[PDB]
Write a protein that binds this ligand. Structure first.
Ligand SMILES: Nc1nc2c(ncn2[C@@H]2O[C@H](COP(=O)(O)OP(=O)(O)NP(=O)(O)O)[C@@H](O)[C@H]2O)c(=O)[nH]1
Ligand SMILES: [Mg+2]
Length: 160
């Protein structure tokens, strides 16, 4: 019934692979196993009787990849201010290439490290709203908010 392409973008520290690995295999590593290039995995969802097939693309965080993407997940580290500010560049590039068609997610990952938070939740949420994106909080380490993120993204892509 539905087939969607989703790309994860963000800096080297943020947890892109960790989000996908937790969602697809229910595994997590404290080790930073550096992603050397882009690749995709397939995840199947059944929402309202409707079969949704996701092509989830991972990228090396350190145009050809996000071409024809139905959704983009822009990941930052809540303990790293630089990683949040970097999200803004991605939004600009994606909106120039694809317009309002692409469903954007701005994702504050590592919420298990709330004690070490350096990104303003209010700034992040405000920014997300200003660019027509939705903001999400996740922890790949504790498996929090990930099911909700992908489910909501799928709902929004179906509604497009
Ligand atoms: N505490 C905590 N650490 C996390 C979380 N998600 C990822 N990390 C940690 O952040 C580091 C980088 O994770 P990784 O998923 O490899 O990031 P990446 O965005 O794929 N990096 P790259 O672009 O280089 O492949 C690892 O040490 C990993 O354990 C999380 O939710 N909480
Ligand atoms: Mg990675």
């Amino acid at each position: 019934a539905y087939s969607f392409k989703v790309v994860l973008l963000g800096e080297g520290c943020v947890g892109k692979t960790s989000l996908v690995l937790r969602y697809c295999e229910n595994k997590f590593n404290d080790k930073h196993i550096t992603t050397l290039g882009a690749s995709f995995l397939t995840k199947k969802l059944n929402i309202g009787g409707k079969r949704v097939n996701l092509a989830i693309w991972d990228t090396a965080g350190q145009p050809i990849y996000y071409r024809d993407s139905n959704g983009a997940i822009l990941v930052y580290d809540i303990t790293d201010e630089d990683s949040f500010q970097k999200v803004k560049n991605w939004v600009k590039e994606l909106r120039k290439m694809l317009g309002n068609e692409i469903c954007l997610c701005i994702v504050g990952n590592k919420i298990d490290l709330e004690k070490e938070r350096h990104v303003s939740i209010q700034e992040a949420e405000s920014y997300a709203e200003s660019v027509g994106a939705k903001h999400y909080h996740t922890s790949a380490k504790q498996n929090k908010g990930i099911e909700e993120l992908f489910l909501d993204l799928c709902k929004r892509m179906i509604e497009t």
